[PDB]
Amino acid sequence: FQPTNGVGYQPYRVVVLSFELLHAPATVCGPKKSTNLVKNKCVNFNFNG
Amino acid sequence: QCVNLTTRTQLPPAYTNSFTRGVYYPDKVFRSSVLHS
Numbered sequence: 483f484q485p486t487n488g489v490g491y492q493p494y495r496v497v498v499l500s501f502e503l504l505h506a507p508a509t510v511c512g513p514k515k516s517t518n519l520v521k522n523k524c525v526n527f528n529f530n531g
Numbered sequence: 532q533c534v535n536l537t538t539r540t541q542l543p544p545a546y547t548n549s550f551t552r553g554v555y556y557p558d559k560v561f562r563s564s565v566l567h568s
């Protein structure tokens with residue numbers, strides 16, 4: 483790792499994000515507002531994705 | 532800290548017939564009456 487080196491030798495910080503779905507009650511969720519839950523209505527539900 | 536316990540009788544390991552036990556839930560999915568393989 484030297485600054486005098488050209489393209490192809492510079493250090494690159496790599497972060498790999500991994501996750502499993504549909505196997506356990508999730509806790510991490512994206513930013514989305516929660517609306518009121520109606521009971522007897524044909525609606526488009528979205529529970530944890 | 533370690534203490535080597537002595538004065539222990541040496542016996543051969545015994546065995547028994549494990550009956551129909553050890554069944555666990557493979558997943559957290561609720562199932563009412565489906566015979567899931």
Ligand SMILES: *[C@@H]1O[C@H](CO)[C@@H](O[C@@H]2O[C@H](CO)[C@@H](O)[C@H](O)[C@H]2NC(C)=O)[C@H](O)[C@H]1NC(C)=O
Pocket residue numbers: 533534535
């Ligand atoms: C309990 O027994 C073990 C087994 O011999 C002892 O571990 C030995 O310790 C000596 C001294 O440090 C080593 O030279 C041997 O190589 C060890 N043997 C093994 C198999 O690891 C242990 O010291 C004993 N503990 C007490 C409190 O007497």
